[PDB]
Amino acid sequence: GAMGSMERASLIQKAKLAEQAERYEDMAAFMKGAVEKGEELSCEERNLLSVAYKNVVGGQRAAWRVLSSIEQKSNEEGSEEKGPEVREYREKVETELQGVCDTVLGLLDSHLIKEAGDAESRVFYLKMKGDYYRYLAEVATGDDKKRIIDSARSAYQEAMDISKKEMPPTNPIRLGLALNFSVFHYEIANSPEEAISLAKTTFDEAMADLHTLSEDSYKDSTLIMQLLRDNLTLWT
Amino acid sequence: GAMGSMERASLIQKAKLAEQAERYEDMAAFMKGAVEKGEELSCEERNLLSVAYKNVVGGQRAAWRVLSSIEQKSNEEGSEEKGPEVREYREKVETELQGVCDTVLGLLDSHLIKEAGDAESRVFYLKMKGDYYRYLAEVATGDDKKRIIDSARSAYQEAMDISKKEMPPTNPIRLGLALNFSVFHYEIANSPEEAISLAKTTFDEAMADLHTLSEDSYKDSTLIMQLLRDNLTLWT
Amino acid sequence: RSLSAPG
Amino acid sequence: RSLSAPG
Ligand SMILES: [Cl-]
Ligand SMILES: [Cl-]
Ligand SMILES: [Mg+2]
Ligand SMILES: [Mg+2]
Ligand SMILES: [Mg+2]
Ligand SMILES: [Mg+2]
Ligand SMILES: [Mg+2]
Ligand SMILES: [Mg+2]
């Protein structure tokens, strides 16, 4: 590891600087180095890891979608053949995206999930595992796709089971997990009714628990509830 | 060169795809590979080269400014010492930025400028040479800085001399060159009066030539004239 | 496309 | 900061 010679605290400090500078590839490399020190991550450090890789893979996903759309138009009837370049470059970006997802999944497997005993950490990491298998599923097309989809579903389901037993229905990790599992159902698993049902039940159970929250917690929970509502508006 | 096995036309095609996908590092690598084929660049290809490296170095410059500002605040009176991490990370980004500038300057020197005989190509490349020495000057602090500044000035001056002899005062390359030389004067060379004088004379000479232009050329020229005016408003 | 959880 | 030439 190229970060093996840097102090854990220095890696965390530099991840925060990289976030401020919008240098998300650097941020992800610093947080990978911090994970590889072998100690568990605090709440703040888990957030830094998630922010870093979310931004890296988010740029890759946006680029892959642009290139996939160009490629699909090139394969429509009446399109003049442009050679292999669109496919090759889409494949290049796709392979890079898959590499980032595999890197994240490898960190979760070695050994973040197995050492995560508290609900807040274990649910966070299992949600991440579902998310990065979902990003793999977005580009999967072989006999690969069904197994990747099942891996995403399995991680999300384990996270859901823990979150329902151990967290209040307004907990932002629980809410973001349910949001992302509903997106999995709608966009990946061809299960829009399950997506709508999960988003509705999640929203309603959180609404009924808002009265227990402080002003700051209320703001955190309602932000994610609004995304559930925004999706329900798009889906219904 | 990692692009040595790819066809020149395929590199250009992929640069255009990378632009559409906002993958500017890829775009720059493709255009570097195209330059290294050894043939001169067309007008469109020069623009692709410029767009690619402008976006790469633009992100580096923005990041360097964020980190330099944090570092300067850490060195103000009453700041608690945070260790070497801010300086180290600013230095990392700075070195990467300098590497990109050196790469561009190397392409111009091997051998784009020497083969550029038409005014439109030679002025374009000399402006680029001034620009990337200007970006080096933005971060320079040693006994290095004076020589880097002189190198930027020399390239801009040669470009100006050719542009005034060979192009109309509304030519967008000539206008963008004069704009960037005025920025050099204001921001790098501590010569705000020279910056203001150059921006004013450039604007007024272009205004007097707009009557010769088509609607489309008029739009191209007035876009850059507005930037001259915007700077004059900031500077006066 | 659907909205997913932010940072 | 001053504006420079765009693409
Ligand atoms: Cl490629
Ligand atoms: Cl560093
Ligand atoms: Mg240590
Ligand atoms: Mg593939
Ligand atoms: Mg139904
Ligand atoms: Mg050939
Ligand atoms: Mg330095
Ligand atoms: Mg004066």
Numbering used by the authors:
A (entry chain A), B (entry chain A): -4 to 231
C (entry chain P), D (entry chain P): 508 to 514
Recite the paper's sentences.
The 14-3-3σ protein, which has multiple interacting partners with specific peptidic motifs, was used as a case study. We have observed this phenomenon first-hand with human 14-3-3σ, a protein which has several hundred known interacting partners in the cell. Furthermore, different isoforms of the 14-3-3 protein are function-specific. For example, the 14-3-3σ isoform (but not other isoforms) specifically targets p53 and is associated with tumour suppression, making it invaluable to determine crystal structures of the target peptide with the correct isoform.
To address this problem, we present a combined co-crystallization and peptide-soaking approach to obtain crystals for any 14-3-3σ–peptide complex that may exhibit difficulties when crystallizing under our optimized ‘sigma’ conditions. The second step involves, after these 14-3-3σ–cJun-pS227 crystals are fully grown, displacement of the c-Jun peptide via addition of the desired peptide for the final structure at high concentration to the crystal drop and incubation for a period of time until full occupancy of the peptide is achieved. We have found useful criteria to be using the peptide at >95% purity and performing the soaking at 277 K with an incubation time of one week. To demonstrate the experimental reliability of the method, we considered this approach for peptides found in the PDB where co-crystal structures were published with isoforms of 14-3-3 other than the sigma isoform, since they were not able to crystallize under the standard ‘sigma’ conditions or any of the other hundreds of screening conditions tested. Not only does this significantly reduce the production time, but new 14-3-3–peptide structures that were previously not accessible with the 14-3-3σ isoform, despite screening hundreds of other different conditions, were now also able to be resolved. The new strategy that we present here has allowed the determination of several new structures of 14-3-3σ which had not previously been possible, illustrating the ease and success of the method. All models were determined to belong to the orthorhombic space group C2221 using Zanuda. In addition, the method retains the robust, stable, high-resolution and well diffracting features of crystals originally grown in the sigma screen.
